[PDB]
């Protein structure tokens, strides 16, 4: 069997301003690898993860299940503006080692005040569109 070895997941969160959430928003599960056997999701802390990131939105890629032991993968997160352009990109500098149940991401992905300022056009109609591009280098 062949494998989906790179993939891009687009996720829109409606009414983001009214996200009454350390509380997590979880995306749908999406699949990768051979026979859809690698399962992933995105997880968002809209008000931060811990106290040191209260001013930020945190965003993580989580490996939900995998057939073997480890998966090594590079990943990139970005926000799509109204024009569909990628902006505020952050990417792993290297492949990270994932095992079933483990996440990797950015506690300080983006400042809340920057995200909430309408002049930056990142919440058109109160909608946050995240973009996650993954490249699996092993498994």
């Amino acid at each position: 069997s062949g494998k989906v070895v790179k993939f891009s997941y687009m996720w829109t969160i409606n009414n983001f301003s009214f996200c009454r959430e350390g509380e997590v928003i979880k995306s749908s599960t999406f699949s990768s690898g051979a026979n859809d056997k690698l399962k992933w999701c995105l997880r968002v802390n809209p008000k931060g993860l811990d106290e040191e990131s209260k001013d930020y939105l945190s965003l993580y890629l989580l490996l939900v299940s995998c057939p073997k032991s480890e998966v090594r993968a590079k990943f990139k997160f970005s926000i799509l503006n109204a024009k569909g352009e990628e902006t505020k990109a952050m990417e792993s500098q290297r492949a990270y080692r994932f095992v079933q149940g483990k996440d990797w991401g950015f506690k300080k992905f983006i400042r809340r005040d920057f995200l909430l300022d309408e002049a930056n056009g990142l919440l058109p109609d109160d909608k946050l569109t995240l973009f996650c591009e993954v490249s699996v280098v092993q498994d």
Binding site: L49, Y60, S92, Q93, Y96, G101, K102, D103, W104, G105, F106, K107
Partner: peptide, 7 residues
């Protein structure tokens, strides 16, 4: 650098 929330 990326961070993880799980031990």
């Amino acid at each position: 650098k990326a961070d993880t929330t799980t031990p």
